[PDB]
Structure formats: structure tokens, C-alpha cells
DNA sequence: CCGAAGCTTTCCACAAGATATATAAAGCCAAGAAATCGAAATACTTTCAAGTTACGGTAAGCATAT
């Protein structure tokens, strides 16, 4: 991910919307060094997080009302405090990065 | 009549030798098969590198409420 004259360090999305989308009509979620072979200027470490991070569809996400406390409390009554912990291996993509 | 120059081989002698059984106990040497075991190569288990994906840790620059 790093001296590669072939890589592109940028923020925004160009060509990305077709380039990486296109794998979720092709590939699985395995295998990923597949895609790199054809998308430049991307590397698999960065593009398996943001796929993933990007096309997740089951997350808390909205203004916070006066019910999602008690989701936050529920949340962290599960295993524990979950952010760090051993127990955010069993979190269903509820890693601690977020 | 004085002087000068030419022991290996091939056969008779016939009296011994040679090749022949025959037990017969005894161990060994000696070549041909049958059984046995050592060296190991073409294979199988396990060890060990080597890159690689699932799973996160902090941190930085932009949207929007007060």
C-alpha cells in the first residue's frame, strides 16, 4: 500500500462507482486481490474496508431521538464495552473503528 | 751347395607303479540353491517459511446546529 507508483493517494470517488461496484455483481466477498488486477490505483487493504463500510445497509444511523439511548444501553449491555474489548469479535460489524 | 722365403635324446630293459573295490567311523572344505536381512529411492507425514485477508485502532478535514 505504500511506494507503489501505480497507486492513487485521492479523496474523492472518480470512476470508483464502476470500477468497485462492479465486483458486487462479479465476485464474492473473497478474494479480493482479483479486483485489484483490474481497478488502478486502488490496493485491496483500503477498498475491503471501503466496501464494506460503504455498502452496509443494517446500521444506527439518524438523528438521535429519544429512543436510541436505550439502543446505546442495550448495545453495550450485550458483552460489554465492546469498543476494544475481545468481545468486538463476536459483534455482527460492530467494530470499535466505528 | 749354401741361402732365402714360405649330454639331451632317443628306446629296450620288464620290475615295479597306476588305477582300480570296501566298509567306515570321524570334521571340514566347496559350489549350487533357498531363506534372510541391509541400503535406499520413489513416496507419504510433518515442519516451516512466505505472502495475504478478516478484523480492527487512532486520527484528520468537512457538514450543520447554536
Known sequence: ????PGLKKGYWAPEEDAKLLQ???KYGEQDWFKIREEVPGRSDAQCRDRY???????????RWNLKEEEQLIELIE???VGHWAKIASELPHRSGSQ
Open 52 to 62: 464494506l463500510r460503504r455498502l452496509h445497509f443494517s446500521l444506527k444511523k439518524g
Open 23 to 25: 465486483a458486487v455483481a
Open 1 to 4: 500500500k505504500s511506494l507503489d
Open 78 to 80: 450485550k458483552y460489554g
